[PDB]
């Protein structure tokens, strides 16, 4: 219809380490365009576009506002990291659910594609590998991306083209830090 | 080159305001998962996970103060920019189950809509081309680095052979509302 406009404001705390190095960046967005940006490495509000020149200057002529924003690196980022975030994110535990599926079967001696579904897990460094009779396979392997379920859990699907005889058994192997020893799911033909 | 890597990253509050219509929104997200958000008119902090609210507490009055200052920021910007155009983008949807599909066992179907701009979208569900609304959850609008937004909807359903489910999306940047059909097996 007529003129519509969208505005956005955000302030990100980058934690490269635990409590050693913290970084703070505030961003102002107008119509999917950023026009004012503050960085903890800079120390003052800079205009990423010319439109944000006077606004950032208003935040550069006020010493109390600048000192407050500089102190927000410890009062907003570090304070939340050492308190609530350590007590609500590290404490949240998970366990991956690993199942096995098959698109097509028939005699199974022909070409086939085995599926390993690892669902309902909190995202972390996972090493998923296909094993045929104990030996790892890499050819014909196709795994989906990290699928964000949006409810704190994640999901992933891995696929292996399994051609060999029914007499052999296949197995899916996943390595997730929330589980001490890697769970191993086996499927018989 | 534009992306910088960190061990953990938290937005600690995202403010979105749209004019006209006075569309406000204020959330709280960390490392991808939404910790909680702040209701607009109810003046209360709504946690995505109930256990998360048993250990931390956020003051929603600061939420209303920041959404009001964002309103003022957009107001003075639209008054100073005079005649500037705004663009629209068509979103893309993807339907997938939450847990592995087992026929006869209750499951949750998720409809993920990415590249939403502007964040004004109707996400509905249809069961066998029929209107259904039994336990339809909708998360808040997560933010992407493209300054677009991605939301997720939930439907608790029973997978059966006589039922086919589709997710319908109605957007301002879509010439017609698009429907993604889905039938397991």
């Amino acid at each position: 219809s007529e003129r519509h406009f969208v505005y956005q404001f955000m302030g990100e705390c980058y934690f490269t380490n635990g409590t050693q190095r913290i970084r703070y960046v505030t961003r102002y967005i107008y119509n999917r365009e950023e026009y004012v940006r503050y960085d903890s490495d800079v120390g003052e509000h800079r205009a990423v576009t010319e439109l944000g020149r006077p606004d950032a200057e208003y935040w550069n002529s006020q010493p109390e506002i600048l000192e407050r924003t500089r102190a927000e690196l410890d009062t907003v980022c570090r304070h939340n990291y050492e308190g609530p975030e350590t007590h609500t994110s590290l404490r949240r535990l998970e366990q991956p659910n690993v199942v096995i599926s098959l698109s097509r079967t028939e005699a199974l001696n022909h070409h086939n594609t085995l599926v390993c579904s690892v669902t309902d897990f909190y995202p972390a460094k996972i090493k998923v590998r296909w094993f045929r009779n104990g030996q790892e396979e890499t050819v014909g392997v196709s795994s989906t991306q990290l699928i964000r379920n949006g409810d704190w859990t994640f999901q992933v699907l891995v696929m292996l083209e399994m051609t060999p005889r029914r007499g052999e058994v296949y197995t899916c192997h996943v390595e997730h830090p929330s589980l001490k020893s890697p769970i191993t799911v086996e499927w018989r033909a | 080159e534009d992306d910088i890597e960190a061990d953990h990253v938290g937005t600690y509050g995202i403010s979105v305001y749209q004019s006209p219509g006075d569309i406000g929104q204020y959330t709280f997200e960390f490392d991808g998962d939404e910790l909680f958000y702040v209701d607009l008119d109810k003046k209360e902090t709504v946690w995505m996970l109930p256990e998360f609210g048993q250990l931390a507490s956020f003051d929603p009055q600061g939420g209303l103060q920041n959404i009001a200052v964002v309103k003022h920021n957009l107001g003075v910007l639209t008054k100073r920019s005079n005649s500037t155009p705004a663009t629209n983008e068509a979103p893309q949807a993807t339907v997938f189950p939450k847990s592995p599909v087992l026929l006869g066992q209750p499951n949750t179907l998720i409809c993920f809509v990415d590249n939403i701009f502007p964040p004004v979208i109707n996400i509905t569900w249809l069961r066998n081309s029929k209107s259904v609304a039994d336990g339809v959850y909708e998360t808040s609008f997560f933010v992407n680095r493209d300054y677009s937004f991605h939301k997720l909807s939930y439907l608790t359903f029973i997978p059966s052979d006589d039922d086919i489910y589709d997710c319908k999306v109605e957007h301002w940047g879509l010439e017609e509302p698009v429907l993604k059909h889905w039938e397991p097996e």
């Binding site: 404001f9 302030g11 505030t26 004012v36 006077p54 606004d55 208003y58 935040w59 506002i65 407050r68 924003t69 927000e72 009062t75 907003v76 304070h79 939340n80 308190g83 609530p84 | 600690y12 509050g13 403010s15 709280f28 250990l55 931390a56 507490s57 956020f58 003051d59 600061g62 103060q65 920041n66 200052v69 964002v70 003022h72 920021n73 003075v76 910007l77 008054k79 100073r80």
Partner: peptide, 16 residues
């Protein structure tokens, strides 16, 4: 005593 410590997010304001 255990408390629900959680620091708020602080925005800013321009004049224009």
């Amino acid at each position: 005593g255990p408390v629900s410590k959680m620091r708020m997010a602080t925005p800013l304001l321009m004049q224009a």
